[PDB]
RNA sequence: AGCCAGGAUGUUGGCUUAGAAGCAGCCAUCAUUUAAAGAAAGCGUAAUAGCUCACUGGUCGAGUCGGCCUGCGCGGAAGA
RNA sequence: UACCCGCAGAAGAAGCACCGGCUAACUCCGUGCCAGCAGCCGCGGUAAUACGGAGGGUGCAAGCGUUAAUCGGAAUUACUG
RNA sequence: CGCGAAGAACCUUACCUGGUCUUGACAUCCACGGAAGUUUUCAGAGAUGAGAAUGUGCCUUCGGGAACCGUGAGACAGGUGCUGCAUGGCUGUCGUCAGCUCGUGUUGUGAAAUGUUGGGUUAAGUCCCGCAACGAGCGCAACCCUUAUCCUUUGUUGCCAG
RNA sequence: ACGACCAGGGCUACACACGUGCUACAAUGGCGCAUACAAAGAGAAGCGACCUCGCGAGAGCAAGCGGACCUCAUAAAGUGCGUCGUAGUCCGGAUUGGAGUCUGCAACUCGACUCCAUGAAGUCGGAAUCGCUAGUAAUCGUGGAUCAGAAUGCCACGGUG
RNA sequence: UUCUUCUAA
């Protein structure tokens, strides 16, 4: 009963936490009007507007009513815990044990529906990182950020896969494209595009003078064979490079952006990758613009476009600080092992 | 041939929707008061409903039906 | 009208800028090359008298700062020089 | 880079993986309860769980304390967590390199220069001479430890010529 | 809990790269026998004679000694005699098998050692590069620290030169 | 005889 009573408590604890994060009254005050608009039979005279109101009314309802059913079923747990203790029956005692568990899973999906309320979360994504303009500092600095997500998607458990591998000569790597793969990999990584800043005293410096570096991050969902727009082969620059003669360089001229594939000994599959690369890249270039037409450039990761300081990494002090949410940590290497996931949910539970 | 009547029981299969009901539909498609009537022919509904079919008997009082072999046709088949 | 008389009671009546040096006046805290500041030298890349806030202190005063503009300083067109 | 670490089978050990704990393993304070101590059992990988007899050393008109346990309450603990560009301490390095400086003095507007230079000389800013410098300090030398030889002393567990 | 404990693991992994070492590639050597030859330490839960057995590692007995007394503890190269006779060797010993000794709760990871078997590479090492100026280089042993056990390391010590 | 270059508190 000692885990069970905390399993009454800690379950009900996070229940009211989610009640704030919905702002389900802003759903419900809309809903209650939409309910009054529904039972108004004038909603049916435009039956298109009826389902646009009423199937939305159903969409407004059960998302709110989950949390209502969360508090209501937890009342029956402690009531059966009352009937567990004042009448010591081991069934009702274990009914306080067993039927308690069925509560959270109602919220556990819906909080997952609330956290991943973003639309193309369920797809996976690709990764696009260049070393910044720090210098030889930066090339290493990308290769650190290389393994950080490698260990992350190892730890989070996604299929890592090097689409493209470019290098800095003296230190680290210059730029990279990698296929991440699995459930909600764009669900995670959509909140982590852009600037990652190195600040440490430079061994590359002849003295130990404190220099600064940067790197890029860019995340775009795997949405080819899901998005209907086809790449025009004219802006699709046909260009060939080599394996690491079979590799295919694609330069999308009008938006000036590129994508590649390097590994396939068959040249077509380097291209067959790069079609999947670029069509996913064009749609993200559309959908970053599209959530910029939602209100403004606000419902994406605020203002990516090189204002993306969303995490910045300080090493001599060994502090790592988020910027799009602003959550901090000292366990710098754990984040380099992939405790960057705490920053992802920092974006998601803040609603970014 | 028409013509009179019905055209059914439910779990209106689940679905998942626009509400999904023989009839948008993924999908089973049963039992059922049976003269018969299908988890249905189509149309219709926003869906149901509405029309309506198969169907069944009532009426009708000679055949009826569409195959195949062919004979000759016919359309297709507009120019300075 | 000036001007005077009573009435009433502390009553109805103070703010703005500044404090790294230049230049009179400082600490605390937020903050970490960000946000910013700034006439100049120049500040802020975790301990900021230079940022922001606090308290404190300086400077004016029904004003106080900023900008604009002028000559001075500038002997920096040097008659003087 | 046979470095920390003069010596990781567990220990060490900080690490990894599970089992565990939250005034805590460790201090002090505080009350509360039992002398402390002593033996055993199972449960448990063990951390620990319930058993099992015991005890009264020390003082008192003595909570049973002073001894030691356990409980409560917290004040507090704890950190091999960060920072050797916040530090002390300590250490390498140039390098046992011969250099580094000061005082007053004079010189230059001054920064500075002078001496400390120059010449002979030394392993050495070592010495001498010259010397607007003259002095002083730290030094590079000497004092020290050992060995090289001799004398005296004492001669056992050391010595054996006679 | 960046705190406290416990077990097990790991710190010893392993395509690699480098430093520092050690041992060899032999005949000035190997082997065998015989034999001359130290210095400096350590020692009480320690050193442990002697004896016994164990091929050996050891065990058992068990003195002695806080040590100029006893023990660790014969130094080793050397020398003398023989042997190998220029070969992957009677060089050299890697590796591995089997059987043990021993430490310590306990030797899988992950100890040390004995014995038997095994007999790799290696036949003087690129460009380069290190040390050292006299008891030095060179090579010969020995002790100590640390330490249940566990040193080619380290710290010392004498031998030849 | 020949021989260069040293990111940005
Ligand atoms: Mg080397």
Give the nucleotide at minimum CA-to-C1' distance from A312: C34
Lookup: tokens for A347? 């974006």
Lookup: tokens for A138? 């930066």
CA distances from A305 to A123, A266, A290, A292 (A): 23, 35, 14, 12
Cβ contact A51 with chain B strand, < 7 A: yes
Beta bridge partner(s), residue A177: A128, A164
Cβ contact A136 with chain F strand, < 7 A: yes
- Helices A2-22/A24-39 angle, 10° precision: 70
Q: Distance (Å) from CA A279 to C1' E22? A: 64
CA–CA gap between residue A61 and residue A35 (Å, rounded) = 10
Q: Which of residues 207-236 of A touch strand D (CB under 7 A)?
A: 207-209
Q: Which helix (H) or strand (E) holds A37?
A: helix A24-39
Cβ contact A317 with chain D strand, < 7 A: yes
* Pick from A221, A196, A201, A188: nearest CA to A291: A221
Which residue is listed with tokens 């009314």? Answer: A57
CA–CA gap between residue A87 and residue A93 (Å, rounded) = 9
Give the nucleotide at minimum CA-to-C1' distance from A47: B46
Ligand 1 geometric centre to CA of A170 (Å): 21
Q: How many helices (H) and strands (E) does chain A have?
A: 9, 12
Ligand 1 geometric centre to CA of A186 (Å): 48
The approach used to solve this structure was cryo-EM
Ligand 1 geometric centre to CA of A168 (Å): 26
φ, ψ for residue A250, nearest 5 deg: -115, 120
CA–CA gap between residue A310 and residue A304 (Å, rounded) = 9
Which residue is listed with tokens 């025009």? Answer: A232
CA–CA gap between residue A74 and residue A94 (Å, rounded) = 15
């Amino acid at each position: 009963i000692n885990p069970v009573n905390n399993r009454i408590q800690d379950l009900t604890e996070r229940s009211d936490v989610l009640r704030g994060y919905l702002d389900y009254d802003a759903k419900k005050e809309r809903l209650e009007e939409v309910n009054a608009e529904l039972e108004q039979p004038d909603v049916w005279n435009e039956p298109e507007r009826a389902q646009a109101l009423g199937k939305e009314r159903s969409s407004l309802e059960a998302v709110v009513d989950t949390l209502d059913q969360m508090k209501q079923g937890l009342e029956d747990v402690s009531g059966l815990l009352e009937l567990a203790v004042e009448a010591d029956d081991e069934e009702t005692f274990n009914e306080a044990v067993a039927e308690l568990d069925a509560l959270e899973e109602k919220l556990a999906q819906l909080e997952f529906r609330r956290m991943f309320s973003g639309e193309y979360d369920s797809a996976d994504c690709y990764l696009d990182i260049q070393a910044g303009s720090g210098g030889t500092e930066a090339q290493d600095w990308a290769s650190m950020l290389e393994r950080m997500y490698l260990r992350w998607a190892e730890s989070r458990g996604f299929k890592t896969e090097i689409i493209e591998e470019s290098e800095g000569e003296v230190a680290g790597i210059k730029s990279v494209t990698i296929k991440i793969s699995g459930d909600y990999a764009y669900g995670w990584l959509r909140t982590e595009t852009g600037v990652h800043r190195l600040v440490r005293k430079s061994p590359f410096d002849s003295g130990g003078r404190r220099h600064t570096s940067f790197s890029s991050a860019f995340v775009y969902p795997e949405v080819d064979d899901d998005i209907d727009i086809e790449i025009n082969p004219a802006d699709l620059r046909i260009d060939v490079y080599r394996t690491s003669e079979s590799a295919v360089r694609i330069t999308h001229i009008p938006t000036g952006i590129v994508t590649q594939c390097q590994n396939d000994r068959s040249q077509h599959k380097n291209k067959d990758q790069a079609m999947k690369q670029m069509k996913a890249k064009l749609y993200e270039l559309e959908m970053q613009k599209k959530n910029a037409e939602k209100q403004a450039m606000e419902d994406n990761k605020s203002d990516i476009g090189w204002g993306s300081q969303i995490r910045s990494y300080v090493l001599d002090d060994s502090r790592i600080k988020d910027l799009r949410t602003g959550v901090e940590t000292r366990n710098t290497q754990a984040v380099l092992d992939g405790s960057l996931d705490q920053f992802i949910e920092a974006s998601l539970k803040a609603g970014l």
